[PDB]
Design a protein around this nucleic acid. Structure first.
Length: 154
RNA sequence: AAACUUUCAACAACGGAUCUCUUGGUUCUCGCAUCGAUGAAGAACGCAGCGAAAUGCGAUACGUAAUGUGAAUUGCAGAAUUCCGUGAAUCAUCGAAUCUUUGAACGCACAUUGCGCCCCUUGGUAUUCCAGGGGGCAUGCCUGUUUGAGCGUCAU
């Protein structure tokens, strides 16, 4: 598998990937960018706080018309949300990546998530039926995710 | 200052253009004349050791016979020197057969798997009732035969 733009030594890094997932790309991108450059332990504590409805996720690009809150203040923004489905897939891949890093022989105490990205995936289509006997699409926004952890140095 | 917005590049994505290929098409030319009541074309249904199709076939059902070549089929299983043989094969050829219900469609009828009549035979105590099996029952027209009708008409 060929991953995105990664400036690290592959020997001190461990990778994970999830393709053709049925989460929303727009929320998953925010969920992923909220943990880029972080340590795995703090990220995994954060993503559970989210599900407990503390320490929200900031929405920065895909943020139109959503509501405001006060768990954005630790990031500066005033728009945030708590996307459980995206969080759960991301937690799964973090788990997988830590497993792979362990098996390659790296120390979990000082790993950080270096390169994380999501992509768009092929849509999945259904019909919805509007007034006056016409159809319109009702389709999902699936996502690929790819993720790299690596151990810190100077 | 970050986020955000925009521009470029790398990598990855959506998407499937371009390039190359092509058991297909189209056009031209040459040759041939070969459907059907001896039941056509078409249709329905069904058939394989495991197939829904396409292709093939018809209760002898991806086929039987005959002829030729001469050792395969193959997705799997199952058979196997039968392989110096009357002989493998989703082979080729094809002259013998089968060819369900249909259909011009032919006992009558059909939105029915409806209802009959005749002959021979078998069974049930059975020229008469029931069942099975086989074979028959259309119309128009022609030739001939057989039986007839008519003070139309001839002779005795």
């Amino acid at each position: 598998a060929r991953y995105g733009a990664t400036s690290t030594n592959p020997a001190k890094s461990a990778s994970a990937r999830g393709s053709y997932l049925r989460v929303s790309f727009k929320n998953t991108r925010e969920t992923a960018q909220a943990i880029n450059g972080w340590e795995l332990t703090k990220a995994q504590k954060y993503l559970e706080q989210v599900l407990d409805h503390q320490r929200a996720i900031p929405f920065r690009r895909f943020n139109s018309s959503i509501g405001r809150t006060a768990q954005g203040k630790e990031f500066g923004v005033t728009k945030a949300r708590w996307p459980a489905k995206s969080v759960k897939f991301v937690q799964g891949l973090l788990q997988n990546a830590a497993a792979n890093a362990e098996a390659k022989g790296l120390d979990a105490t000082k790993l950080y998530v270096s390169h994380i990205q999501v992509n768009q995936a092929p849509k999945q289509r259904r019909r919805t039926y509007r007034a006056h006997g016409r159809i319109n699409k009702y389709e999902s926004s699936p996502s690929h995710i790819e993720l790299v952890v690596t151990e810190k140095e100077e």
